[PDB]
Curated annotation (Swiss-Prot), chain A:
Lineage top rank: taxon: Eukaryota
Expression (tissue specificity): Expressed in epididymis (at protein level).
Portion of the parent chain present: 128 to 177 of 605
UniProt remark on domains: The N-terminal D domain mediates homodimerization.
Region (Homodimerization domain D): 3-52
Localization terms from the record: Cytoplasm; Nucleus
Protein name: F-box/WD repeat-containing protein 1A
Source species: Homo sapiens (Human)
């Protein structure tokens, strides 16, 4: 249901917003573990400016 | 969990069917909503995984 992806994404964001700071972290790291090298590159390049 | 574990599992399932670029846009969104401290954990997890 690819026309439903925006709505899926909004629900997941909603669920995520109700979790504790550490479940949130555990979740993002799990997602990261399932992604490929190129995905890892574009999140790193997004995270890096934001650490300062 | 268990509420988090029920919901995390649903989220993971939705995620696995998104395109590689919707996956990235999504994670990037999650991160934009996080602590400087959460960011430090993510960075620490991600940096060894690069090389």
């Amino acid at each position: 249901g690819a026309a439903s992806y925006e709505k899926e994404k909004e629900l997941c964001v909603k669920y995520f917003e109700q979790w504790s700071e550490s479940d949130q972290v555990e979740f993002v790291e799990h997602l990261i573990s399932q992604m490929c090298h190129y995905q890892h590159g574009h999140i790193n390049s997004y995270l890096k400016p934001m650490l300062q």
